[PDB]
Design an enzyme around this catalytic site. Sequence first.
Site, PDB file in Angstrom:
ATOM      1  N   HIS D  71       0.827  -1.210   0.000  1.00  0.00           N
ATOM      2  CA  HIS D  71       0.000   0.000   0.000  1.00  0.00           C
ATOM      3  C   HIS D  71       0.857   1.253   0.000  1.00  0.00           C
ATOM      4  CE1 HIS D  71      -3.324  -2.829   1.170  1.00  0.00           C
ATOM      5  NE2 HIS D  71      -3.940  -2.075   0.279  1.00  0.00           N
ATOM      6  N   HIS D  75       1.337   1.026  -6.028  1.00  0.00           N
ATOM      7  CA  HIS D  75      -0.061   0.584  -6.001  1.00  0.00           C
ATOM      8  C   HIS D  75      -1.042   1.683  -6.356  1.00  0.00           C
ATOM      9  CE1 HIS D  75      -3.876  -1.106  -4.834  1.00  0.00           C
ATOM     10  NE2 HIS D  75      -4.017  -0.204  -3.878  1.00  0.00           N
ATOM     11  N   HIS D 111      -6.645   7.045  -2.979  1.00  0.00           N
ATOM     12  CA  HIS D 111      -7.444   6.023  -2.275  1.00  0.00           C
ATOM     13  C   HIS D 111      -6.788   5.235  -1.162  1.00  0.00           C
ATOM     14  CE1 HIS D 111      -5.790   2.748  -4.730  1.00  0.00           C
ATOM     15  NE2 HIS D 111      -6.443   1.903  -3.949  1.00  0.00           N
ATOM     16  N   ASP D 229      -8.789  -1.532  -8.248  1.00  0.00           N
ATOM     17  CA  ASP D 229      -8.216  -1.883  -6.946  1.00  0.00           C
ATOM     18  C   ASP D 229      -7.998  -3.403  -6.797  1.00  0.00           C
ATOM     19  OD1 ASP D 229      -7.157  -1.090  -4.536  1.00  0.00           O
ATOM     20  OD2 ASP D 229      -9.078  -0.912  -3.502  1.00  0.00           O
ATOM     21  N   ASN D 232      -4.936  -6.709  -9.750  1.00  0.00           N
ATOM     22  CA  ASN D 232      -3.692  -7.524  -9.741  1.00  0.00           C
ATOM     23  C   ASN D 232      -3.781  -8.906 -10.460  1.00  0.00           C
ATOM     24  OD1 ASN D 232      -2.577  -6.406  -6.374  1.00  0.00           O
ATOM     25  ND2 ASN D 232      -2.793  -5.296  -8.314  1.00  0.00           N
ATOM     26  N   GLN D 280      -4.416 -16.945  -2.944  1.00  0.00           N
ATOM     27  CA  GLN D 280      -4.688 -16.313  -4.240  1.00  0.00           C
ATOM     28  C   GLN D 280      -5.815 -17.010  -4.992  1.00  0.00           C
ATOM     29  OE1 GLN D 280      -3.630 -13.355  -5.463  1.00  0.00           O
ATOM     30  NE2 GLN D 280      -2.576 -13.178  -3.486  1.00  0.00           N
TER      31      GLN D 280
HETATM   32  C1  LIG Z   1      -2.269  -9.832  -4.981  1.00  0.00           C
HETATM   33  O1  LIG Z   1      -2.940 -10.346  -3.822  1.00  0.00           O
HETATM   34  C2  LIG Z   1      -3.793  -9.597  -3.058  1.00  0.00           C
HETATM   35  C3  LIG Z   1      -4.050  -8.260  -3.405  1.00  0.00           C
HETATM   36  C4  LIG Z   1      -4.913  -7.446  -2.670  1.00  0.00           C
HETATM   37  C5  LIG Z   1      -5.579  -7.916  -1.540  1.00  0.00           C
HETATM   38  C6  LIG Z   1      -6.492  -7.011  -0.771  1.00  0.00           C
HETATM   39  O2  LIG Z   1      -7.432  -7.514  -0.168  1.00  0.00           O
HETATM   40  C7  LIG Z   1      -6.216  -5.510  -0.725  1.00  0.00           C
HETATM   41  C8  LIG Z   1      -7.193  -4.779   0.179  1.00  0.00           C
HETATM   42  C9  LIG Z   1      -8.372  -4.071  -0.364  1.00  0.00           C
HETATM   43 CL1  LIG Z   1      -8.667  -4.047  -2.119  1.00  0.00          CL
HETATM   44  C10 LIG Z   1      -9.240  -3.422   0.509  1.00  0.00           C
HETATM   45  N1  LIG Z   1      -9.028  -3.425   1.840  1.00  0.00           N
HETATM   46  C11 LIG Z   1      -7.972  -4.043   2.404  1.00  0.00           C
HETATM   47  C12 LIG Z   1      -7.029  -4.740   1.648  1.00  0.00           C
HETATM   48 CL2  LIG Z   1      -5.637  -5.556   2.428  1.00  0.00          CL
HETATM   49  C13 LIG Z   1      -5.394  -9.325  -1.081  1.00  0.00           C
HETATM   50  O3  LIG Z   1      -6.070  -9.765   0.036  1.00  0.00           O
HETATM   51  C14 LIG Z   1      -6.682 -11.051   0.123  1.00  0.00           C
HETATM   52  C15 LIG Z   1      -8.181 -10.993   0.312  1.00  0.00           C
HETATM   53  O4  LIG Z   1      -8.808 -12.036   0.240  1.00  0.00           O
HETATM   54  N2  LIG Z   1      -8.752  -9.807   0.543  1.00  0.00           N
HETATM   55  C16 LIG Z   1      -9.993  -9.679   1.301  1.00  0.00           C
HETATM   56  C17 LIG Z   1      -9.900  -8.628   2.399  1.00  0.00           C
HETATM   57  C18 LIG Z   1     -11.070  -8.172   3.016  1.00  0.00           C
HETATM   58  C19 LIG Z   1     -11.017  -7.199   4.014  1.00  0.00           C
HETATM   59  C20 LIG Z   1      -9.784  -6.684   4.411  1.00  0.00           C
HETATM   60  C21 LIG Z   1      -8.606  -7.133   3.807  1.00  0.00           C
HETATM   61  C22 LIG Z   1      -8.666  -8.104   2.804  1.00  0.00           C
HETATM   62  C23 LIG Z   1      -4.466 -10.202  -1.861  1.00  0.00           C
HETATM   63  O5  LIG Z   1      -4.254 -11.512  -1.491  1.00  0.00           O
HETATM   64  C24 LIG Z   1      -3.320 -11.849  -0.465  1.00  0.00           C
HETATM   65 MG   LIG Z   2      -7.782   0.780   0.653  1.00  0.00          MG
HETATM   66 ZN   LIG Z   3      -5.984   0.048  -2.863  1.00  0.00          ZN
END
Ligand SMILES: COc1ccc(C(=O)Cc2c(Cl)cncc2Cl)c(OCC(=O)NCc2ccccc2)c1OC
Ligand SMILES: [Mg+2]
Ligand SMILES: [Zn+2]
Lengths: 322, 333, 330, 330
Positions: D71, D75, D111, D229, D232, D280
């Site tokens: 973050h 990104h 964001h 967002d 990826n 993933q």
């Molecule tokens: C390339 O891989 C990833 C990329 C992005 C995420 C996010 O969830 C990012 C992200 C975003 Cl969009 C919005 N609020 C926080 C974060 Cl942490 C991600 O997370 C896995 C995943 O399953 N995400 C669900 C989630 C729900 C609520 C809070 C945090 C996460 C990834 O996998 C490990």
């Molecule tokens: Mg965010």
């Molecule tokens: Zn973001």
Amino acid sequence: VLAKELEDVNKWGLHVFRIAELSGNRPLTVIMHTIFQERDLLKTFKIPVDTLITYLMTLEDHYHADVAYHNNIHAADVVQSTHVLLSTPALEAVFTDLEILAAIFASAIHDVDHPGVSNQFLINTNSELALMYNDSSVLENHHLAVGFKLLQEENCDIFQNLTKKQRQSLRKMVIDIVLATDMSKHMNLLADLKTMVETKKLLLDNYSDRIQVLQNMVHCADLSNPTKPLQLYRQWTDRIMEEFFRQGDRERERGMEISPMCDKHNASVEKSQVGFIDYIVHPLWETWADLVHPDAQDILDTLEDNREWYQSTIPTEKFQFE
Amino acid sequence: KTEQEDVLAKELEDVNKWGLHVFRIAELSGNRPLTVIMHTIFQERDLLKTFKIPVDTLITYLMTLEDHYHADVAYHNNIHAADVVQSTHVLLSTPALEAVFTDLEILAAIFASAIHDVDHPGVSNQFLINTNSELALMYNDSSVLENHHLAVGFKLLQEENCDIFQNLTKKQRQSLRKMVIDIVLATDMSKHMNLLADLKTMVETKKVGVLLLDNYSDRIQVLQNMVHCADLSNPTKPLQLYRQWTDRIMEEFFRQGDRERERGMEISPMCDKHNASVEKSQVGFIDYIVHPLWETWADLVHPDAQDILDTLEDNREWYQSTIGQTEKFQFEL
Amino acid sequence: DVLAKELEDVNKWGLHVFRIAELSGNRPLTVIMHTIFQERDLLKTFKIPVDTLITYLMTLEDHYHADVAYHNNIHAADVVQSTHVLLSTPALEAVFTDLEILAAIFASAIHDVDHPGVSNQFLINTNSELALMYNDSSVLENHHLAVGFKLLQEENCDIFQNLTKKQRQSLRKMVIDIVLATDMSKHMNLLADLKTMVETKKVTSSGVLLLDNYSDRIQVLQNMVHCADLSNPTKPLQLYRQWTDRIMEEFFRQGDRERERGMEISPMCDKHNASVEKSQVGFIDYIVHPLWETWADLVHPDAQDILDTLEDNREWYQSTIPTEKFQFEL
Amino acid sequence: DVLAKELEDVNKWGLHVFRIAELSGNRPLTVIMHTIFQERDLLKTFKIPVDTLITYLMTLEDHYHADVAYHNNIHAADVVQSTHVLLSTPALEAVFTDLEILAAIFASAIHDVDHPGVSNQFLINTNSELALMYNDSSVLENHHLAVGFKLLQEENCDIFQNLTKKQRQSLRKMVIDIVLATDMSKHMNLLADLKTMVETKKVTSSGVLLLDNYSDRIQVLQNMVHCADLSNPTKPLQLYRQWTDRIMEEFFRQGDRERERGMEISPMCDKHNASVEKSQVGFIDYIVHPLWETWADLVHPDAQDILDTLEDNREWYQSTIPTEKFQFEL
Ligand SMILES: COc1ccc(C(=O)Cc2c(Cl)cncc2Cl)c(OCC(=O)NCc2ccccc2)c1OC
Ligand SMILES: [Mg+2]
Ligand SMILES: [Zn+2]
Ligand SMILES: COc1ccc(C(=O)Cc2c(Cl)cncc2Cl)c(OCC(=O)NCc2ccccc2)c1OC
Ligand SMILES: COc1ccc(C(=O)Cc2c(Cl)cncc2Cl)c(OCC(=O)NCc2ccccc2)c1OC
Ligand SMILES: COc1ccc(C(=O)Cc2c(Cl)cncc2Cl)c(OCC(=O)NCc2ccccc2)c1OC
Ligand SMILES: [Mg+2]
Ligand SMILES: [Mg+2]
Ligand SMILES: [Mg+2]
Ligand SMILES: [Zn+2]
Ligand SMILES: [Zn+2]
Ligand SMILES: [Zn+2]
């Protein structure tokens, strides 16, 4: 489509099992023929196309379908990997078309008619092969004989429009290359190449230096599984171990001492792969990367990512060291 | 991949080069220069992905389009269309036009080049007008063939599995369609003077590393002239190829003359085999038409079109080395 | 410096010979010859003092005409180097002795010395002193040889001073037989004899040419230098096109001389009624290809890359066409 | 210089954003935003002084944390350019005004600004002053906006100075609506609304989507940036894998802090018990694929190749398998 997969013929990480399936178990024929076109080897050495195909199919038919690792997929992989290695920028315009052909043909035949067991299994069982080759590079000697012998079948002489000198020269090179695939030759090969990296000009102005690069190249292609996209590498490990455990089952049936890595009841598959990289693959592929700096850095980096992947998963080392 | 297919693929690696051996490609492809070249250029430019053009649909259309060029016509056949297609493909990638055109504008120039002479009968608009042909009667004696070429190129989209534009939105299709029409109608030689005068005016007050073109009039102006330059590109090709183009157009012109003679018609400029000076006609074509056009273009994209303009003047000199109604004719365009 | 990097291509067919002439300061034949002799270790082999060599090469080159557009020291350099590459053809590996090799290159270096830039028949028509000495027969070719050997007698010029009498007498013979074969009137018969060789062709166990008598060994050496002489149409088009532009300027000057004098103008020498491109196609069709076609089959398949350019360059000249009885009756 | 050659691909899905970050000197947000503003003519349209825009972008970008693996500005840049590509999809041609485009692009840019590399829950359970200020509701997403708009007040940073009150009030409502929708707790209802719209979809006379009310218009822009967002996994595998490595590193830093403090470790945050590929796959099966499948439906067939890649990249992660309650819950 198959054709669209063959477009990656020039790239490290070709979808080789995918090509095996799509061509109907003809990866060696389709890949060898692509590369021969790609390199203009049919025009240069006036190889007739029917003669080339017929030979390639013949060569491929003499790889065993029941052998898990040393079959036609393995042979196509070493042929294609040598084709990529030849094309590295630091070797640009170094080899003649005859040496190019030699390394590629040597790669094609290098394991032909493999029974899926080691030289020592053949030696210990008093095999007809080990008796003929006096327990010395038994299979590696055999791979050469079969590969050359196969030119004599109907419409298989692909070297028929080569001059006497071209055939002599080619023959010597192919022999020196495939005999360097014997593992008891790895230590001295790595050493000789270790010295070349230190006193290099790139230029190679005598046969002894030229065959030596070509030898190690095909040797790295042979030992290249760990340097591949992990999903392919993983498939090479499933395949070699399946073959290894079978010899172990055979050795065990016969009351023989089970060979290193062949005991399915005592197998550290993951630990053996880190050992293969640490002791054999990495020490060699690092020396290659020096010879051709920085042409193989991504190949070298993929190797270190795979070793780390295999390490994480850990829940024969005497043999690796020697 | 067969042995001929490999040799053909080896020729096709020069698709990005001026003076591609287009007649060898015609032979090697089994008389499919336009299908193979168009297919190559669409792959190279990723036009299939961008416009979601199914590959079977693209090949089926290409063949169908090429099938509507007349094999018995010596110049305005499918080898000519492939040449104008390829020549435009090169001019689009010229350093001074880098990133100037959108994906749709590129598709428009290339598709327009492919269709621009489809179904050409080997004779001029005036022959068709003077004989009261149905074609002339339908298009009121105005850009008769150029209207036809367009009508047919769009018509064949409706054959089975031929609509290469099936996944474009109405906006995309309306835009493309209008650009192709602007480009092909610009190939009528009665438009040469205005097309060039406007291009001259552009060069005069031109903004720039690469050229700045903001409105529709100026972008369509450059695209129209570019295709007009590909259309008039024979004299700028290596002599080996240019000489072939001359024999071909003269064989076409001479056939029309024999038909005009048969019919007791007045013989059109350059169509009289018993009274033609092939070399002299070429020097006129260059001096009056091709040079002032390619000179101006070379100003616009300076200095990208320098070798091209130099080949042009080398070829003019060679035709000069080897040396009325036709000068009158060439003078008035 | 700059020269040294161009001269690394002395084993290649297509050496930038015109640039070498520039960089050496109008001294191509000297450097290319000196390069070839060191390359083949011909100084150590034949005990040639390097100052005696260079003096002779300077002397020989000086006796090529600087005012002649084609048959100058640049043409000689070109023939020397083309023989040098032709001698390394795989099908001839280990065939020829060092003396036979020295003979080929020597012959090539001297083959056109003191060329006046006009034909034998011009010399014969005008009652020239040279034609009267050599009885109208291979007038220039006899002279080239005679000049080439007589310059060995100038100060510090005898490069064969350490050859044995048997070597000297044998070298002299081969050099004579070679250069006398460059008379275009011997061409019809030279080709006939090379043809009869391909039809009854013996090859050694190693694959290379089996020549075991003198008649055949010289025969091959004659046609080789004859191929080196007629090697222009088989070089990169950028070189070839310069040789055509040079031969014609020299041909045209002859025609200007003949017109001035009320003499009938020789084929290809009329600048006012000339077909430069079509005469190149005639040169290739009637003389060069038929010769290089039979050489290719003699050293099959060594001379394939060279035959492909002769057919490529024929097409480039054919495409640019807007004296045939001359080319035919040879 | 080599930067210009990479920024040519700014209109394209799969831009080498990491390479652009190295070449700009860790300035991907500034160069990428600036490129897009130049390409969309936004400075002219809204009379944004060019120095004001740069100073702002350098400021905004300076407020993304460098020590945060995922973050961060890279990104932010990646989400900006993806939205920019998505705004240009053929099926949305001439749908959105210039100010709506400005809103989506600016929202993408701000964001995650000042993101500390931990989740909301972490900020809540540790009683951070930020959780206290935002009453535990959309803690970070409220903060990213407050910072994003707060920085306009730094010296020469007001990129909106020449917008009328009406425009400013409208842009602001849109940016807030968009960023607050990046809270994953909103994923379910955002998707459910996208599906609804797909089911009752109207096209104009010219084949582009019809949206006659603010609720429908903001839904799409929210989902667009939400798609950017969560984009990826729809990238070239080589890009995706760097994204995966960077997030997991960020996740793993937080797990180490939770362990240190005696806290329960959040899903995907234990470096000792991690299933990086299984995560993933689940991330794709539960969240990313259902979202993009529905988007690709809205913009049919514009996003077919984006969707195909997604499906290739999932299979690559299955092949490398030697959290789910969490994923499913959303
Ligand atoms: C390339 O891989 C990833 C990329 C992005 C995420 C996010 O969830 C990012 C992200 C975003 Cl969009 C919005 N609020 C926080 C974060 Cl942490 C991600 O997370 C896995 C995943 O399953 N995400 C669900 C989630 C729900 C609520 C809070 C945090 C996460 C990834 O996998 C490990
Ligand atoms: Mg965010
Ligand atoms: Zn973001
Ligand atoms: C991807 O996994 C592998 C792939 C290949 C090998 C080989 O050694 C292949 C191979 C080759 Cl190149 C040449 N002689 C025989 C074989 Cl068996 C391999 O072996 C590990 C290993 O440590 N190899 C050393 C070795 C020395 C002597 C005889 C046999 C083996 C692998 O690890 C289990
Ligand atoms: C290399 O040889 C040539 C190739 C093409 C042309 C054309 O004019 C082709 C062509 C094109 Cl572009 C567009 N409308 C018709 C044709 Cl016929 C050509 O014509 C020379 C010439 O002077 N053309 C002028 C002209 C004006 C109006 C109608 C027809 C012709 C050539 O020289 C004889
Ligand atoms: C690159 O162009 C050329 C290069 C060399 C020649 C020669 O024939 C040179 C040359 C040589 Cl080898 C030997 N006797 C005299 C000369 Cl003049 C040449 O001549 C063409 C040609 O048709 N030559 C045949 C000929 C020449 C002389 C006597 C009898 C027959 C060329 O074409 C114009
Ligand atoms: Mg082996
Ligand atoms: Mg037309
Ligand atoms: Mg002579
Ligand atoms: Zn092997
Ligand atoms: Zn045309
Ligand atoms: Zn000569």
